[PDB]
């Protein structure tokens, strides 16, 4: 298996989520471990804020809600900062803001030979008003839904960065700021495990 250790270092509760994996309530300092069969080709992890769940595991989250479930089986309602992973000849991974921001996030391969990208900045403090929602900051693609921001159709093969994407890129240069951002994928030989941290420390 490939193991992901997902730790909440924020001073607020984060309901972690994974496709695959499900979800887990993480109070400050708690960890969730997710094992992927090493034949698995992909993973998508995120955190959810402002959740309430009943004993049956139904409820709702202010950001990142997955079908009103504690244990996710669908993708999260935008906005939510993403940690993404795929495996082929090696591992490819990234922190992504393409579907918005809610919580700062880092992904750290246990193999120190490989880069550990992070989005550490409080993007919620700087979010333009048209992208702002309670608890997070949407991407221009999710708000406006047009092809220049979403990099579709006439823009699929030639999608320039925009004023909106560059606000995200300023805050978090290592993260995907839009669908075709060319300076946000990192790679590592397969065999490493990973840590994902909400509210990573900064120097």
200 is an interface residue for Cl ion by CB under 5 A = yes
Closest CA to 75 of 20, 15, 136, 138: 20
Q: What angle do CA 130, 84, 59 make, to 5 degrees?
A: 65
Taking the alpha carbons at both ends of the chain, their separation in whole angstroms is 32
Q: Taking phi first (over 0 means left), then psi (-120 to 50 degrees means alpha), and beta for anything else, what does residue 153 get?
A: left
According to CB under 5 A, which one of 28, 33, 73, 190 is a site residue for Cl ion? 33
Closer residue to Cl ion, CB minimum distance, 82 or 199 = 199
Closer residue to Cl ion, CB minimum distance, 40 or 62 = 40
Closer residue to Cl ion, CB minimum distance, 201 or 203 = 201
Q: Order of strands across the sheet with 91-96?
A: 22-26, 14-19, 42-48, 82-87, 91-96, 186-188
Give residues 110-129 in contact with Cl ion (rule: CB under 5 A).
Answer: none
Stretch that binds Cl ion, among 11-19, 24-32, 38-46, 49-57 (CB under 5 A): 24-32
202 is an interface residue for Cl ion by CB under 5 A = no
201 is an interface residue for Cl ion by CB under 5 A = yes
32 is an interface residue for Cl ion by CB under 5 A = yes
Stretch that binds Cl ion, among 61-69, 70-78, 142-150, 195-203 (CB under 5 A): 195-203
Distance CA 131, CA 118 (A): 21
28 is an interface residue for Cl ion by CB under 5 A = no
Distance CA 15, CA 22 (A): 10
Residues at the contact surface with Cl ion, assessed by CB under 5 A: 32-33, 197, 200-201
């Amino acid at each position: 298996v490939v193991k992901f250790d997902i730790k909440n270092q924020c001073g607020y509760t984060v309901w972690a989520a994974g496709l695959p994996g499900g979800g887990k309530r993480l109070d400050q300092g708690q960890t969730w471990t997710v094992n992927l069969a090493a034949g698995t080709a992909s993973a998508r992890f995120w955190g959810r804020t402002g959740c309430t769940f009943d004993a049956s595991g139904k409820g709702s989250c202010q950001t990142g809600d997955c079908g009103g479930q504690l244990s996710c089986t669908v993708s999260g309602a935008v906005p939510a900062t993403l940690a993404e992973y795929t495996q082929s000849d090696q591992d490819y991974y990234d922190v992504s803001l393409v579907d918005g921001f809610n919580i700062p996030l880092a992904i750290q391969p246990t193999n120190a030979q490989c880069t550990a990208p992070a989005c550490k900045a409080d993007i919620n403090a700087v979010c333009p008003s048209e992208l702002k929602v309670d608890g997070g900051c949407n991407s221009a693609c999710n708000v406006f839904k047009t092809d220049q921001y979403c990099c579709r159709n006439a823009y699929v093969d030639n999608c320039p960065a925009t004023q909106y994407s560059k606000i995200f890129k300023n805050q978090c240069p290592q993260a995907y700021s839009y669908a075709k951002d060319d300076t946000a994928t990192f790679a590592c030989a397969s065999g490493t495990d990973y840590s994902i941290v909400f509210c990573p420390h900064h120097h």
